[PDB]
């Protein structure tokens, strides 16, 4: 009946329309702060000197961007990995010029999203569920840590963190390919197998269950009315679905066990995206994709180009053009 | 050595080509390495004074061993490919090099991450097992069926 | 957790077909355009502002500079029938690199 | 910014026409017995 006891009961209550919980106590203020700053900056922030060379890049709608080009621009290369909260600036005008909003957003976001993951554990415990949905979510979350925090740490600057915008995302990807040959890295290749395969198995599972729906409706009703929320019987015939797919390939290539099947559907994209995240997080320390430049040589010693050498030529074009005013010395060492 | 006055040399952006100021005023190396001004190392500290890199020491006191060390470290930067071709990603084959710092950092980030996953896996399982529902929901005692609707 | 949830299992599994299948179909339409060089290459308003105002920069203009490097540095070996010879002096490059 | 003068009407009708189509269908569903 004491206030702290009552408060704890409301916080951890399974009857709130949206679950709060103890992770929620951190998640809710941090995500609101990141969301509010992001929206205001995306609409109205002035240009940001991302590369620390007094060459401010315009990210906001009011300063000449559309939805595709706009961004919240990473903080200045002059800051590096230094902590740049609002109270470190002499003024909000300075804070904006130097990319302050970016640090505020990504730090509140990363904390809030980590708490989002813990909150998934927490509610599952309160509902008497098994606990590992939060483990599935760790794959996208690790990917966010990779591009907003780990890659900046390895390279020594939040100015190399992924920008908060659509074209800025493409800028990060192209420069990443120039500096790490990520396409030739096996962890990114596993990532592609993860998302291509995830999309494939998503369509596959969707089509197989849809194909074996038991007739419960008339020609004029949507078949979705054949399922009632919370009914005890399964709504499709997995024996028919397996009988179809096992004949499409061969019997043993198909799942008849729904638990095995759904475990596979969870594991394949999650594992692949884990390797994607580890790809970014280890190229953060410059262990890069395979380099077969000039690997094939004829009897005299003439280089015989392969498709790897053509990739290299494309990478070079990205390399020499990116941040065209920021390099004074011949090697791009970070 | 070719005769440049490195203190007064303005780079293309207007910042010093060789020397500039940190956001708090210290004299630091220019170009992209402005981000690395927190670096400290025994081959560089003889050049640093109370206000940062000291232009008089730079003009007069750089020893051959410092030039040697800086050339060595510049050309052994921790960058290289997974098949151990040293250099940037566009480098041609020739130098067999990946820094021990890259091997040690990448391996232990990979291991640390999977160990965080293992922590979540086993912490969530130990909680569910201690409460008695790690094998699934009891059909006759499904907690949510005993809760009021959300709406 | 999220605010919304599935409640109809038939809708859920149809949606799993719909989302990746529709996505692939859309990408196919774009590639049919690229067959004709009918690209979404530029935003004309961006180019007009950038051409007249040399202090105006966005991530969109930054990416086109990357594209211009890709074309110049990759075309001679990637398109050998064209017999491209681009003397060093014409190659687009930023400072130092 | 020198944007296309037809962009506004294009975006407005693109939203409004299918949106009102759905609202019409939804409301007459609600009003059924």
């Amino acid at each position: 009946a004491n206030l702290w006891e009552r408060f704890c009961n409301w916080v951890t209550s399974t009857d709130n329309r949206l679950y709060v919980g103890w992770f929620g106590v951190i998640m809710i203020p941090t995500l609101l702060a990141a969301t509010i700053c992001f929206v205001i900056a995306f609409i109205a922030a002035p240009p940001v000197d991302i590369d620390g060379i007094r060459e401010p890049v315009s990210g906001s709608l009011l300063y000449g961007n559309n939805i595709i080009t706009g961004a919240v621009v990473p903080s200045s290369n002059a800051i590096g990995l230094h902590f740049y909260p609002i109270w470190e600036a002499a003024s909000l005008d300075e804070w904006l010029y130097n990319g302050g909003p970016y640090q505020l957003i990504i730090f509140h976001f990363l904390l809030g999203a980590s708490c989002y993951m813990g909150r998934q554990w927490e509610l599952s415990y309160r509902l008497g569920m098994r606990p590992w949905i939060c483990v599935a979510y760790s794959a996208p979350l690790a990917s966010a840590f990779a591009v907003f925090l780990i890659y900046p740490i390895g390279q020594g600057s939040f100015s190399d963190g992924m920008p908060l915008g659509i074209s800025g995302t493409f800028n990060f990807m192209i420069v990443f390919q120039a500096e790490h040959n990520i396409l030739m890295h096996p962890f990114h290749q596993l990532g592609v197998a993860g998302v291509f395969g995830g999309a494939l198995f998503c369509a596959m599972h969707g089509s197989l269950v849809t194909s074996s729906l038991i007739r419960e409706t008339t020609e004029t009703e949507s078949a979705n009315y054949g399922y009632k929320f919370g009914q005890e019987e399964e709504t499709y015939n997995i024996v028919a679905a397996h009988g179809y797919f096992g004949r499409l390939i061969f019997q043993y290539a198909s799942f008849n066990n729904s638990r095995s099947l759904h475990f596979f559907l969870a594991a394949w994209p999650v594992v692949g995206v884990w390797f994607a995240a580890l790809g970014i997080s280890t190229m953060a320390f410059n262990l890069n994709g395979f380099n077969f430049n000039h690997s094939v040589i004829d009897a005299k010693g003439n280089v015989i180009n392969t498709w790897a050498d053509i990739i290299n030529r494309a990478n070079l074009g990205m390399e020499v053009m990116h941040e065209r005013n920021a390099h004074n010395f011949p090697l791009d060492l970070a | 050595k070719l005769g440049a006055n490195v203190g007064s040399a303005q780079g293309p952006t207007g910042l010093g080509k060789y020397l500039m100021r940190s956001p708090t005023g210290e004299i630091i190396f220019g170009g992209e390495t402005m981000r690395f001004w927190d670096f400290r190392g025994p081959w560089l500290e003889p050049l640093r004074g109370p206000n940062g890199l000291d232009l008089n020491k730079i003009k007069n006191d750089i020893q051959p061993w410092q030039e040697r060390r800086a050339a060595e470290y510049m050309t052994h930067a921790p960058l290289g490919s997974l098949n151990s071709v040293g250099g940037v990603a566009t480098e041609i084959n020739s130098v067999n090099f990946v820094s021990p710092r890259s091997w040690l950092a990448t391996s232990h980030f990979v291991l640390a991450f999977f160990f965080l996953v293992g922590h979540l896996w086993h912490a969530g399982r130990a909680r569910a097992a201690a409460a008695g529902f790690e094998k699934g929901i009891d059909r006759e005692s499904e907690p949510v069926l005993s809760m009021p609707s959300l709406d | 957790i999220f605010g919304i949830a599935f409640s109809n299992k038939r809708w859920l599994h149809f949606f799993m077909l719909f989302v990746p299948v529709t996505g692939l179909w859309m990408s196919a339409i774009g590639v049919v355009g690229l067959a004709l060089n009918l690209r979404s290459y530029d935003f004309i308003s961006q180019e007009i502002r950038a051409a007249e105002d040399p202090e105006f920069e966005t991530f969109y203009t930054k990416n086109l500079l990357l594209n211009e490097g890709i074309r110049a540095w990759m075309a001679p070996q990637d398109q050998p029938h064209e017999n491209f010879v681009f003397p060093e002096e014409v190659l687009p490059r930023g400072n130092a690199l | 910014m020198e944007v296309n003068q037809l962009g506004l009407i294009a975006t407005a009708l693109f939203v409004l026409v299918p949106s009102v189509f759905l609202i019409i269908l939804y409301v007459q569903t609600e009003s059924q017995q």
Binding site: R17, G230 | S149 | G3 | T11, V15
Partner: peptide, 30 residues
């Protein structure tokens, strides 16, 4: 005009989130 248009569409989506969550068709066990 463009900025107003972009922010308007965004604002409608956020409003849609609110109604889709709090004014959803309630799931009923039948």
């Amino acid at each position: 005009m463009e900025t107003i248009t972009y922010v308007f569409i965004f604002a409608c989506i956020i409003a849609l989130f609110f109604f889709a969550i709090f004014f959803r068709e309630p799931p009923r066990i039948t």
